[PDB]
Amino acid sequence: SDPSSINGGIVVAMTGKDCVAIACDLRLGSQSLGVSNKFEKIFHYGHVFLGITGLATDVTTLNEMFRYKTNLYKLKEERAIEPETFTQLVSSSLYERRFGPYFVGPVVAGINSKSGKPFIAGFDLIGCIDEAKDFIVSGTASDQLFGMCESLYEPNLEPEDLFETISQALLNAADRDALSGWGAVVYIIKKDEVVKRYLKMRQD
Amino acid sequence: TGYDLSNSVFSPDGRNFQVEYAVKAVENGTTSIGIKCNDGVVFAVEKLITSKLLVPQKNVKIQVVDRHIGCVYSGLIPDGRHLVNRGREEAASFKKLYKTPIPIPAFADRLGQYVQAHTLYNSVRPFGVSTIFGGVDKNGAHLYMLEPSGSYWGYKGAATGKGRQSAKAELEKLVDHHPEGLSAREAVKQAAKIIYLAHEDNKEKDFELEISWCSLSETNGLHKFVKGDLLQEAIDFAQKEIN
Amino acid sequence: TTIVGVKFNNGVVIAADTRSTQGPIVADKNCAKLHRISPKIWCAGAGTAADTEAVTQLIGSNIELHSLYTSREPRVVSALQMLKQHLFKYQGHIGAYLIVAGVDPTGSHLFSIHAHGSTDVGYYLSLGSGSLAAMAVLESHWKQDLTKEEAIKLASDAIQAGIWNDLGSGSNVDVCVMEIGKDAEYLRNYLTPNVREEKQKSYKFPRGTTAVLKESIVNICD
Amino acid sequence: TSIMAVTFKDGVILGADSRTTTGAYIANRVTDKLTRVHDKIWCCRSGSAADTQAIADIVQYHLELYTSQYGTPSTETAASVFKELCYENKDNLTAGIIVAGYDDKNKGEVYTIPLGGSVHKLPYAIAVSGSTFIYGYCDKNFRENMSKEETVDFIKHSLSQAIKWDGSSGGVIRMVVLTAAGVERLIFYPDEYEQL
Amino acid sequence: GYDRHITIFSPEGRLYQVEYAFKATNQTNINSLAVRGKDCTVVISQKKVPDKLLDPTTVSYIFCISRTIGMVVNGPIPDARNAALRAKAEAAEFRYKYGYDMPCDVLAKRMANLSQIYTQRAYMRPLGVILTFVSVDEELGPSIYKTDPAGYYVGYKATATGPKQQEITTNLENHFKKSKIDHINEESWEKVVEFAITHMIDALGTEFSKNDLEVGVATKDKFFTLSAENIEERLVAIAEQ
Amino acid sequence: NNYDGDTVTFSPTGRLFQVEYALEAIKQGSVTVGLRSNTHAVLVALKRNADELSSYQKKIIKCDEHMGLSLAGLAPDARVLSNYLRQQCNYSSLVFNRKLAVERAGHLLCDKAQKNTQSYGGRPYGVGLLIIGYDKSGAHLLEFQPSGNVTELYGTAIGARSQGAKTYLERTLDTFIKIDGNPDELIKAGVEAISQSLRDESLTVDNLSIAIVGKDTPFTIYDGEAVAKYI
Amino acid sequence: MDIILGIRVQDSVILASSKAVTRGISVLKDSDDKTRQLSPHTLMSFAGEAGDTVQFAEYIQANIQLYSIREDYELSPQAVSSFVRQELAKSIRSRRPYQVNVLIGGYDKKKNKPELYQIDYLGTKVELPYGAHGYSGFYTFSLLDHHYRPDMTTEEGLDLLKLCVQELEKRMPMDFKGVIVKIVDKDGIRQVDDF
Amino acid sequence: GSRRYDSRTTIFSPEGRLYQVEYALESISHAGTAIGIMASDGIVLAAERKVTSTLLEQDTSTEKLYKLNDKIAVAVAGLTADAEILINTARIHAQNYLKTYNEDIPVEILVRRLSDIKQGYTQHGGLRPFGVSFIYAGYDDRYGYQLYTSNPSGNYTGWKAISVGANTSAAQTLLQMDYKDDMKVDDAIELALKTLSKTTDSSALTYDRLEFATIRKDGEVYQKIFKPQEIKDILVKTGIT
Amino acid sequence: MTDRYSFSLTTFSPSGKLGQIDYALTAVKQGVTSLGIKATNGVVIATEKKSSSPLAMSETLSKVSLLTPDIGAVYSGMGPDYRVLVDKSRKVAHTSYKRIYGEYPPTKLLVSEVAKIMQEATQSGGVRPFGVSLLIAGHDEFNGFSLYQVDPSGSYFPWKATAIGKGSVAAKTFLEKRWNDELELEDAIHIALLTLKESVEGEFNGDTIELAIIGDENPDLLGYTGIPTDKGPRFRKLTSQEINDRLEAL
Ligand SMILES: [Cl-]
Ligand SMILES: [Mg+2]
Ligand SMILES: [Mg+2]
């Protein structure tokens, strides 16, 4: 009866040279029981990517909510929301439910379309922003990811190298967590192209 | 025009005609007076005996607020009762929070602000009463008169109703002839006389006199009605003065 | 967390460490705990991180509107009264423990605020898990009539005591100096004594190391 | 926390220790526990710091508004406002207040609003430990119409004894003297009062 | 013509109810004057007690809003007291919320914003009063800020209000043209009151006894009204010069 | 004319026309008489029928064991005010174990009627009431008018041609006031009083309505064959 | 309310729901139908807290029947499943949450594809080839993981379901009194009369 | 009381018409003409800006044509401020539907709800109706390309080609004359501009006085809100300038 | 008691006119001239300070108001209506934007929110329209410099340059002749002072003229250093002295 660790799953985001990467496992479970191997935890609103770990009903609900809010943002502002602005919106929306929170660990990743600056950010369930140059981790194997990231990560990696680093960080973390795995997706995000790769991992 | 049809509407003069119309209702009412004395206040009122069938002494018009404040009014009697009911709520909420019984100036402003509020909107009618009230507090004796507009001042003597001009004239003479001050027992007798003199402007029906008083010495700072021997003594004094 | 406030001759200085922790795990090795309420009124936060940021920004927002409305530079007593009345209303359920410092037309001020809505006055204050380590240094070296340079030295020394001796505190020292008749100077990473040593080995992977099932181009455009 | 209020010939004196504790840690060792709710109406707060600060601030507002409309309020009126807040919100409040005030008519007056939310008028009052009021506290030691110097010495001694036996109390002794002359603030440092 | 009964625009873009509220201002037939010293702000108002039965001590149009702020009202006493009670409430609430004494100009702006609402909302009538707020502000120093039924407010070097306002205004205008400064260059408030009374006598062309005047004085950290005996002492000083 | 559109508008002479029109509804109403001695208080009412096939409109309503009224004007308004009196009588009994004083009953009706003459949207009550009762200060008769004016009287009458009965009671005052410990004789005086307000029509068995309260007499209403004695 | 199974085959969706209603120590009924027709080509099976299950099912049924009349149009299974999920997601932070788990089996006439949706009481929605709620998945998922093929016929699917029901009847301690089986295809909703 | 000043905005005339609706339609008839034309392979929205000034910023201006979602746009005729209130309501209703069903709102559902809000203001609340007529141009997978209009009455109807605002009588005759069912978008563009060119109260139709948009189609729907330079080009290409 | 006015005081006349909006615009026409000019590298807004009395201190009455660090507003019409609209505008910039996105709203969106408040006074029960027209000058990263007019109806239009109030017809003609798309900020200030001299009758100096610019960031006005991204407010009110300096070379 701990909402953050019923469904399980992990998100990791990393910065490189003129690029960012965000990756997630595909597992949705009901505690011990694996239910789905196709539960993607990474959504995008224009060029701003959001990963969400935690209670799956809140993951789905927050995706539907941020689509709603970014759609209305674009209609009124007549332009796509930027990562820095979207981060503040995620923070606002979570703290609005301060005393009845969404049981989620959201991660923002994207490149500012104006400045071209790589951006990542992480939040706790009530919307405290963790802004980081290097990497952001979330989910049931956050400890494992911190260990992998802190040793593997180096600054200013090229897209092709960053892909390998974040892939190896996620795979090896998910293999040391019972409630994570069952497939993985890595988004490599450059200024004006985004590649999405499905990783081959052990299915236990 | 049509500036007089709705309450709270300013005429091109800058006047609220509906308030001035409420004053007409007050002028139409029976005579009521207040006399400030050495250590307290005296209230008196003209009660018109419409019929023999009225029970004497059992249609009391003067009302007490808390234990220390007397209220008398001329005009629409129900409007006066409505205002006193509010006064009692104000005096109760003041005592509840601040312990001390409401000072008279404090109480005056509570009625003032409430009456004034009934001149701010067209949804309400101004009060059809002038209210003479006062009593004894920590700073001594206070007498006030409050009008439909919400206007009120402190008074040495106050009068309102059909016989106000007669009563005012007789009050002005007392102020001049007693600069060092009037005693409580004297003010009761003078109050009786002034009501009898003011009854000349309302002499079709005969009337019943009613007097109350607050005195630091005579009533121990509380509001009491003048009854029995002291009332009959004041009536006899007034009867002797008209003849 | 270690946060301190130190009053000196012509103003006040606040300092904080830069470590953010989820239980025993360090989430952010260089987060900023020094928050701007107003240009010359700064806030150091301890307890629930979301609550200290949220409460600091709400009062910061209401202070800006009050400053515009009154055509006056905002006062620290206003930030204090607004913070404590907000915190008190929630009976400690907003876990914000603040050191509020600033300069206004009235002079230089230093206050502490507790999550339940109690406030205190002091020449030197400390809050957070490293408060006792910091307070030991303040009770040892604080004197009346400190200079700006003495107060920055005392403040950063108090934070260092926390960094080394408190597991809840670590990484770097942030300082903000609010002097009278001057712009407040925010000294982000004033000290960086905890630089990570060069690793023994590069863990950069040969390309193709990771097994891949599918590639596909994502459409971010319209 | 040791606080006391004593009425003497010329008015009333408010005394308190300067120690605030979170568990066994002294959060503030130079606490000012003497709080102004009007020019010559002060109070000593014991209980929840948040609750007493919240109440004191509301009473200060009420006496400011009272003064605007009805002029200078009596100590009795200040005690009433304190009691009203404490009594009506007793279920969510932990606050024990000693009210000391000077009027020119009534001279010095002391009122206690304990944890109950009741009001009591006394010639003097002591609260030691956890808002614990002592009825007697050397009845023969206190006389009516004492001099200022006698009263300062009486409070200094009483608070000296409390600090000695109690770890909740400590630091400096703060006093406020309420008279016709005005408001005098006294501070007594440990080296003065400890050797008594 | 119901556009003259409520606060809606006439065809020529006017609010007649606001204009008629301004005429109600002079219903008392009382003139007020406010001037600033170096250290003080003085406000004087005519005191007319026509009825002999009135208690003259209770007849006042000067209010102690707070410890530092004084307010004189030109208009009927019911609306005056309505504005006074509200200003007292607003000053007390400000101090509680923001932890410092409400400034003169901020109270003026607040009362002006309330007045503005009465000109836009139909159910509420404007108050037929002009509020003159005086203080020695801790930031701005000696301050005069005046409000009217239109919701207009501004600061003043000096000001006058009432039927013979124009005569007092030009009298003060001419003095400030000569003195070449924004205030009465005078140390003591006593002599600033003497100036205020002198220039009102010269403007209105009437002499004053101790009971014909009402005086308010703002100093640093208190505003107070003068008694009849305080004014009488002041009138003697003028006469002996 | 221009000042009778609602109860929130004074006339230039200071009159409330909507209240004066409500007062007019009472004059159209059927006559009812009230009178009292020191021991008993009596209500006599002339009930009105729509036609010979219809029943006679009940005029008298019991409020408690020691108090009740007769109505003249809008019957539904009498039902609202009598229901309010029942609740106030009942509140006094339940909370204070205390029979509500007839004087306090008057004060409460006055204050209820007043609020309906000062507020926009509402209307004044269109009924007059004669309240009789026996409380701790003996027998009482009150006259209520929807202006809010309540008056304590030895006797009175309200309704069409009430002036006749009111003149008789004014003459008889000294006689009927001393009818102590004799209910039947006090009713007879009330029936002879209402008889002075009759034109063409006379008092029949199903036409006359009498009520009485006193020292050892609960408030009881007599109708039908029970009032045959007094014809 | 215990066993609800769902299999999506090539051209249809099969829902199997236990017939037993147990209250205390007695089996009140052995013929209970734990399903409501939402629209002609959409069926919902449900299991959970007594009363809540039927109340929730009938509430959803009424709302979909209302939409059908208003727009003279059949809402897609994806659209019906999204609506149902949102209602459950509202429920979980309510004063008293609906404790209801549902399978939505529908045939999308626009795509000409069968669709099976699994939504738990929290509003956790997932699209699956085969699904279950509670302990039902623990004894059959291993069996489905093995035999399920996405090009299976309705007859192949029913045989695979029989295997699952047989495994449940063997290893499950409670008696669910067999299952009612309903097929959802392009021609609508029909019940397998004998199982 | 306040009964005296109530216009009773929601009552029937003796002829059974809604006064305020009829007068709102009179208001709209003086507004710049808006034309919608529905083709087999897209929809055209063309609108005339109200007597443009030379110093009006044309390129960063939105008066007539507003986006509701990615698949639905509206052309406005009436009070712009009233339209914006309704447009934001419609934008929210569209996102509410997408949140609930994970499907883009069908065009008619959005139109019906926006029309039902207008209706409400004519039947209850005692407020003035919205002085706005809309042309809704949208696409959904059910009915494909659709044109609707709504007016202050809350009544809405479907169209192949329609005009709202000024000179609709003249505009509708010209559209009825030249429109056919197998029409292409490029043909509809030419018809829309030719119609405005003849019905306009201006001397000559120029790029700076026009707002233009198309909803066209390798299976997705694209909304094109034309730039000033793009209007200038399409105006030369059709040979109007 | 209570607000019984829950019905519109602005209604359509048989001609389709909204009387109270038309009459509000008439009040704006009677109002003192104010204008706005957009340059390539800034925006200028300016108005006359019509002093009610010479005893009055015209400094205390501010006709040009900061709404956000990068947005300023001037008006023509009823001053009190403007003052409460500025208060509501500043608050709505926080409540409906800054407290959500952690940044100040772009010019067009704040203008949109002000327009909404003024539209509500046009339709809501028991209220008259606001008797003011606003000129709102602002900068934001993605739209750059912009100038908007807002009318009592709630309608807003973007302008290269415009004027409102007493002498707006003549002032707009003057701006049409002088305005080009290559104007530098100093050139726009110069033109603003020329334009305003036509509509001002009495004294014309830095004490009778109120003028503010949206231009470069002002680090000196920020009130703190240390955050490189925070470079200070673009809104700057010109001083009495700074205006008089540009009136010599006129
Ligand atoms: Cl305000
Ligand atoms: Mg795993
Ligand atoms: Mg109005």
mmCIF file of C-alpha atoms in Angstrom, chain F residues 59-197:
data_model
loop_
_atom_site.group_PDB
_atom_site.id
_atom_site.type_symbol
_atom_site.label_atom_id
_atom_site.label_comp_id
_atom_site.label_asym_id
_atom_site.label_seq_id
_atom_site.Cartn_x
_atom_site.Cartn_y
_atom_site.Cartn_z
ATOM 1 C CA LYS F 59 -62.105 33.916 12.464
ATOM 2 C CA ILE F 60 -60.618 32.588 15.797
ATOM 3 C CA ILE F 61 -57.258 30.671 16.087
ATOM 4 C CA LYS F 62 -55.861 29.101 19.332
ATOM 5 C CA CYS F 63 -52.096 29.855 19.879
ATOM 6 C CA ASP F 64 -51.572 28.147 23.314
ATOM 7 C CA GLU F 65 -53.657 26.940 26.344
ATOM 8 C CA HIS F 66 -53.574 30.569 27.712
ATOM 9 C CA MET F 67 -53.591 32.675 24.451
ATOM 10 C CA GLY F 68 -55.314 33.000 21.014
ATOM 11 C CA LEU F 69 -56.535 35.650 18.491
ATOM 12 C CA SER F 70 -59.397 36.605 16.101
ATOM 13 C CA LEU F 71 -58.612 37.854 12.528
ATOM 14 C CA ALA F 72 -60.098 40.472 10.109
ATOM 15 C CA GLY F 73 -58.654 40.748 6.536
ATOM 16 C CA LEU F 74 -56.437 38.218 4.635
ATOM 17 C CA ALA F 75 -57.017 34.835 6.428
ATOM 18 C CA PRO F 76 -53.767 33.274 5.026
ATOM 19 C CA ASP F 77 -51.718 36.115 6.690
ATOM 20 C CA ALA F 78 -53.506 35.388 10.044
ATOM 21 C CA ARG F 79 -52.409 31.718 9.508
ATOM 22 C CA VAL F 80 -48.726 32.851 8.997
ATOM 23 C CA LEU F 81 -48.747 35.204 12.082
ATOM 24 C CA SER F 82 -50.775 32.753 14.305
ATOM 25 C CA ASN F 83 -48.302 29.936 13.323
ATOM 26 C CA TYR F 84 -45.409 32.325 14.310
ATOM 27 C CA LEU F 85 -47.153 33.035 17.700
ATOM 28 C CA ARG F 86 -47.668 29.248 18.288
ATOM 29 C CA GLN F 87 -43.867 28.696 17.760
ATOM 30 C CA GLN F 88 -42.933 31.631 20.117
ATOM 31 C CA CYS F 89 -45.436 30.388 22.802
ATOM 32 C CA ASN F 90 -43.920 26.865 22.269
ATOM 33 C CA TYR F 91 -40.235 28.090 22.389
ATOM 34 C CA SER F 92 -41.020 29.866 25.745
ATOM 35 C CA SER F 93 -42.523 26.586 27.184
ATOM 36 C CA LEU F 94 -39.761 24.186 25.948
ATOM 37 C CA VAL F 95 -36.650 26.362 26.709
ATOM 38 C CA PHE F 96 -37.797 28.345 29.843
ATOM 39 C CA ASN F 97 -40.749 26.157 31.123
ATOM 40 C CA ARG F 98 -42.503 29.588 30.943
ATOM 41 C CA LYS F 99 -45.927 30.642 29.494
ATOM 42 C CA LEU F 100 -45.242 33.516 26.983
ATOM 43 C CA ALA F 101 -46.501 36.910 28.352
ATOM 44 C CA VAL F 102 -49.326 38.432 26.177
ATOM 45 C CA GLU F 103 -47.265 41.715 26.109
ATOM 46 C CA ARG F 104 -44.177 39.848 24.667
ATOM 47 C CA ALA F 105 -46.545 38.166 22.107
ATOM 48 C CA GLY F 106 -47.537 41.721 20.998
ATOM 49 C CA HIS F 107 -43.857 42.874 20.792
ATOM 50 C CA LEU F 108 -42.937 39.806 18.614
ATOM 51 C CA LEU F 109 -45.876 40.354 16.144
ATOM 52 C CA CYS F 110 -44.999 44.122 15.942
ATOM 53 C CA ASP F 111 -41.305 43.345 15.091
ATOM 54 C CA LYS F 112 -42.277 40.643 12.490
ATOM 55 C CA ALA F 113 -44.811 42.998 10.761
ATOM 56 C CA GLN F 114 -42.227 45.897 10.787
ATOM 57 C CA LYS F 115 -39.527 43.994 8.757
ATOM 58 C CA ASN F 116 -42.157 43.482 5.959
ATOM 59 C CA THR F 117 -42.621 47.347 5.711
ATOM 60 C CA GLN F 118 -38.869 48.315 5.330
ATOM 61 C CA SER F 119 -37.586 45.668 2.783
ATOM 62 C CA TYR F 120 -38.014 45.765 -1.060
ATOM 63 C CA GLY F 121 -39.726 42.722 -2.703
ATOM 64 C CA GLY F 122 -41.812 41.792 0.393
ATOM 65 C CA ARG F 123 -45.317 43.195 1.199
ATOM 66 C CA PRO F 124 -46.998 44.231 4.501
ATOM 67 C CA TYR F 125 -49.377 41.705 6.199
ATOM 68 C CA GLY F 126 -53.020 42.336 5.096
ATOM 69 C CA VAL F 127 -54.729 41.267 8.390
ATOM 70 C CA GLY F 128 -55.593 42.765 11.822
ATOM 71 C CA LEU F 129 -55.543 40.523 14.954
ATOM 72 C CA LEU F 130 -57.207 40.766 18.413
ATOM 73 C CA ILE F 131 -54.983 38.688 20.818
ATOM 74 C CA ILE F 132 -56.540 37.674 24.208
ATOM 75 C CA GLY F 133 -54.679 35.752 26.961
ATOM 76 C CA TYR F 134 -54.392 35.058 30.728
ATOM 77 C CA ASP F 135 -50.748 35.124 32.022
ATOM 78 C CA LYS F 136 -48.994 35.870 35.397
ATOM 79 C CA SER F 137 -50.311 39.531 35.370
ATOM 80 C CA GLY F 138 -53.983 38.469 34.755
ATOM 81 C CA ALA F 139 -56.288 38.979 31.702
ATOM 82 C CA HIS F 140 -55.053 40.853 28.541
ATOM 83 C CA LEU F 141 -56.517 42.068 25.187
ATOM 84 C CA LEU F 142 -54.165 43.305 22.367
ATOM 85 C CA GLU F 143 -55.015 44.951 18.980
ATOM 86 C CA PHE F 144 -52.461 44.160 16.188
ATOM 87 C CA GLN F 145 -52.293 46.224 12.941
ATOM 88 C CA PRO F 146 -49.966 45.244 10.048
ATOM 89 C CA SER F 147 -48.244 48.688 10.302
ATOM 90 C CA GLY F 148 -46.654 46.922 13.349
ATOM 91 C CA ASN F 149 -48.599 49.040 15.919
ATOM 92 C CA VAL F 150 -49.742 46.748 18.820
ATOM 93 C CA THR F 151 -51.966 48.286 21.583
ATOM 94 C CA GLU F 152 -53.148 46.865 24.986
ATOM 95 C CA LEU F 153 -56.895 47.615 25.545
ATOM 96 C CA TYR F 154 -59.821 46.832 27.944
ATOM 97 C CA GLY F 155 -61.911 46.363 24.747
ATOM 98 C CA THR F 156 -61.910 47.053 20.953
ATOM 99 C CA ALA F 157 -63.307 45.928 17.540
ATOM 100 C CA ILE F 158 -61.843 45.694 13.964
ATOM 101 C CA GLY F 159 -63.467 45.078 10.521
ATOM 102 C CA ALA F 160 -66.445 46.595 8.601
ATOM 103 C CA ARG F 161 -68.724 48.868 10.770
ATOM 104 C CA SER F 162 -66.463 48.084 13.826
ATOM 105 C CA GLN F 163 -66.972 51.750 15.003
ATOM 106 C CA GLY F 164 -70.490 50.792 16.290
ATOM 107 C CA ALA F 165 -69.174 48.026 18.633
ATOM 108 C CA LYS F 166 -66.130 50.204 19.616
ATOM 109 C CA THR F 167 -68.487 53.114 20.662
ATOM 110 C CA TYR F 168 -70.655 50.675 22.762
ATOM 111 C CA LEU F 169 -67.574 49.230 24.602
ATOM 112 C CA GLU F 170 -66.410 52.873 25.248
ATOM 113 C CA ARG F 171 -69.824 53.595 26.963
ATOM 114 C CA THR F 172 -70.072 50.144 28.724
ATOM 115 C CA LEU F 173 -66.349 50.237 29.873
ATOM 116 C CA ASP F 174 -67.196 50.742 33.619
ATOM 117 C CA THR F 175 -69.803 47.853 33.582
ATOM 118 C CA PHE F 176 -68.063 44.931 31.727
ATOM 119 C CA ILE F 177 -64.562 45.543 33.309
ATOM 120 C CA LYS F 178 -65.990 44.407 36.741
ATOM 121 C CA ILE F 179 -67.618 41.154 35.352
ATOM 122 C CA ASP F 180 -65.212 38.981 37.459
ATOM 123 C CA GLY F 181 -65.753 35.189 37.960
ATOM 124 C CA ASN F 182 -68.775 35.203 35.548
ATOM 125 C CA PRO F 183 -67.870 34.008 31.998
ATOM 126 C CA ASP F 184 -71.452 33.936 30.523
ATOM 127 C CA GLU F 185 -72.190 37.617 31.491
ATOM 128 C CA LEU F 186 -68.856 38.839 29.932
ATOM 129 C CA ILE F 187 -69.690 36.945 26.647
ATOM 130 C CA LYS F 188 -73.267 38.467 26.735
ATOM 131 C CA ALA F 189 -71.617 41.974 26.903
ATOM 132 C CA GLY F 190 -69.367 40.998 23.918
ATOM 133 C CA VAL F 191 -72.399 39.667 21.914
ATOM 134 C CA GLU F 192 -74.407 42.887 22.696
ATOM 135 C CA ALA F 193 -71.280 44.880 21.554
ATOM 136 C CA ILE F 194 -70.871 43.117 18.121
ATOM 137 C CA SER F 195 -74.711 43.530 17.674
ATOM 138 C CA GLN F 196 -74.054 47.341 17.310
ATOM 139 C CA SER F 197 -72.053 46.564 14.060
#
